[PDB]
Amino acid sequence: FCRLRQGELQVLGGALLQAPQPVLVKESELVKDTLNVLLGVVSATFSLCQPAQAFTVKRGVHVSGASPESVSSLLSEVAECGTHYARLSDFSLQPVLDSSCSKGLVFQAFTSGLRRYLQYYRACVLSTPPTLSLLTIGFLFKKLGRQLRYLAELCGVGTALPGTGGGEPRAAFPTGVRLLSYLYQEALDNCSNEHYPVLLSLLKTSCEPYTRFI
Amino acid sequence: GPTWQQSLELTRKMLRDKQSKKNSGQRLPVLPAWVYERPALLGDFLPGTGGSADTAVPIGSLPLASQEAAVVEDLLYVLVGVDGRYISAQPLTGRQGRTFLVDPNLDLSIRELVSRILPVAASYSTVTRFIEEKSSFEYGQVNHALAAAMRTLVKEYLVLVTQLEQLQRQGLLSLQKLWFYIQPAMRSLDILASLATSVDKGECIGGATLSLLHDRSFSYTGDSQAQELCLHLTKAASTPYF
Numbered sequence: 001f002c003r004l005r006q007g008e009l010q011v012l013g014g015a016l017l018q019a020p021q022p023v024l025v026k027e028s029e030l031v032k033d034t035l036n037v038l039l040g041v042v043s044a045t046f047s048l049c050q051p052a053q054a055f056t057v058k059r060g061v062h063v064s065g066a067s068p069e070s071v072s073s074l075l076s077e078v079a080e081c082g083t084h085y086a087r088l089s090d091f092s093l094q095p096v097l098d099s100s101c102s103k104g105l106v107f108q109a110f111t112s113g114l115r116r117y118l119q120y121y122r123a124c125v126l127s128t129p130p131t132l133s134l135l136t137i138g139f140l141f142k143k144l145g146r147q148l149r150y151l152a153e154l155c156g157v158g159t160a161l162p163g164t165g166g167g168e169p170r171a172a173f174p175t176g177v178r179l180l181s182y183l184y185q186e187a188l189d190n191c192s193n194e195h196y197p198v199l200l201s202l203l204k205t206s207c208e209p210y211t212r213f214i
Numbered sequence: 215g216p217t218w219q220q221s222l223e224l225t226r227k228m229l230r231d232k233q234s235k236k237n238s239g240q241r242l243p244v245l246p247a248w249v250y251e252r253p254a255l256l257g258d259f260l261p262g263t264g265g266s267a268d269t270a271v272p273i274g275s276l277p278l279a280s281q282e283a284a285v286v287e288d289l290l291y292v293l294v295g296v297d298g299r300y301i302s303a304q305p306l307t308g309r310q311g312r313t314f315l316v317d318p319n320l321d322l323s324i325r326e327l328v329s330r331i332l333p334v335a336a337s338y339s340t341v342t343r344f345i346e347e348k349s350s351f352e353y354g355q356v357n358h359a360l361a362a363a364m365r366t367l368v369k370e371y372l373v374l375v376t377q378l379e380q381l382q383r384q385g386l387l388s389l390q391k392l393w394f395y396i397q398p399a400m401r402s403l404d405i406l407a408s409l410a411t412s413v414d415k416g417e418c419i420g421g422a423t424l425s426l427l428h429d430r431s432f433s434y435t436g437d438s439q440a441q442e443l444c445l446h447l448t449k450a451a452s453t454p455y456f
Contacts, residue, residue: 033323036323039390041322041323041326041327041389042322042323042326043323044322044323095439105434105435105436105437106437108434108437108439109437112439115397119390119393119394119397122390123390123391123394126388126390205437208436208437209436209437212436212437213436
């Protein structure tokens with residue numbers, strides 16, 4: 001029925017759907033690809049920070065409709081957050097980085113602890129939900145991905161705002177002693193999702209190089 | 215054309231001559247070694263290395279678990295310095311990090327994670343090349359002590375590598391867990407690979423090598439994830455000098 005309704009719409013549109021992934025993969029295999037994308041390895045239909053499917057209708061970007069592409073779409077709607085998560089975990093994965101992120105022990109501690117949490121998130125996914133429907137995967141991971149997206153706005157690429165500040169590779173996000181400044185205002189100015197324990201630990205580890213120097 | 219092994223042998227000869235003159239005739243540590251006669255065959259990486267011509271099957275045709283096992287074995291051989299079966303140590307010109315080519319037959323996520331590990335494979339290949347190069351007493355005391363500490367850490371890394379190989383063999387491992395297990399270990403491996411490469415390129419020895427190690431452990435300073443290994447290596451390297 002979904003395919004038939006979409007066929008009617010495509011007949012009236014001139015075939016402007018072209019079924020990006022009309023069906024695939026399965027339950028457990030699509031879950032495996034999505035869990036890989038959430039770990040940070042792009043899925044066999046999903047690239048991280050890149051459209052998973054070549055459909056731009058909400059059947060293929062679709063929590064579900066049973067429509068052609070909609071099986072991919074249920075994954076895709078949550079997937080865009082996971083692709084952002086993956087690029088953010090790459091951003092915070094190494095404790096040292098070029099340009100506005102080189103030097104700084106508090107920056108290395110912050111980036112290492114963020115990579116620690118990214119790794120724990122990635123191991124939680126595709127270890128808790130093996131062979132779970134997309135709906136369960138998305139529901140279970142929503143409360144984690146929202147915190148990840150908040151931290152992605154706080155941190156580097158992996159977000160629709162690169163770093164905190166701006167939305168490009170020139171974000172004001174500090175590093176080093178500049179970061180030991182930056183973080184104090186970012187910590188006061190926002191902690192409103194789930195970062196109170198996490199932000200406390202991050203401030204502690206960022207101050208650990210500052211506290212060392214002092 | 216000189217390769218990194220030929221360059222290091224010529225450097226060894228010139229450094230022996232230099233210490234011979236600088237010592238005014240005092241004794242130098244010299245021994246017969248066949249390690250240089252076949253370094254690539256002793257778990258290291260030298261210009262001329264590759265993958266495996268005797269272990270080569272289509273990983274794509276192989277099931278996902280079989281592909282994972284084969285890739286884990288090739289990765290662990292690269293992480294011990296020897297070639298893989300689908301991960302091939304590539305030749306190096308001049309002493310640098312040993313690069314490892316991944317067979318393109320691997321799955322996109324699989325090849326992705328193989329490449330992610332490949333940093334570890336290159337680190338271990340360069341580590342074992344430096345280990346077996348400074349293992350012989352021609353360079354300074356600090357150089358030989360550094361080689362000793364580096365080969366100790368490489369042996370511990372290879373114990374871990376064999377445990378991980380067996381766990382993958384039974385199917386109790388994933389690329390994410392492989393990347394996660396040795397994160398401080400891989401940090402230390404990268405740090406010590408950078409230190410070793412700086413030593414090899416600048417042919418540091420004596421207090422030059424000591425200054426290299428001190429700068430290696432001092433450029434970061436404070437707070438640690440893998441600098442414990444570098445500090446231990448620096449202490450052991452400077453033990454004869456100290």
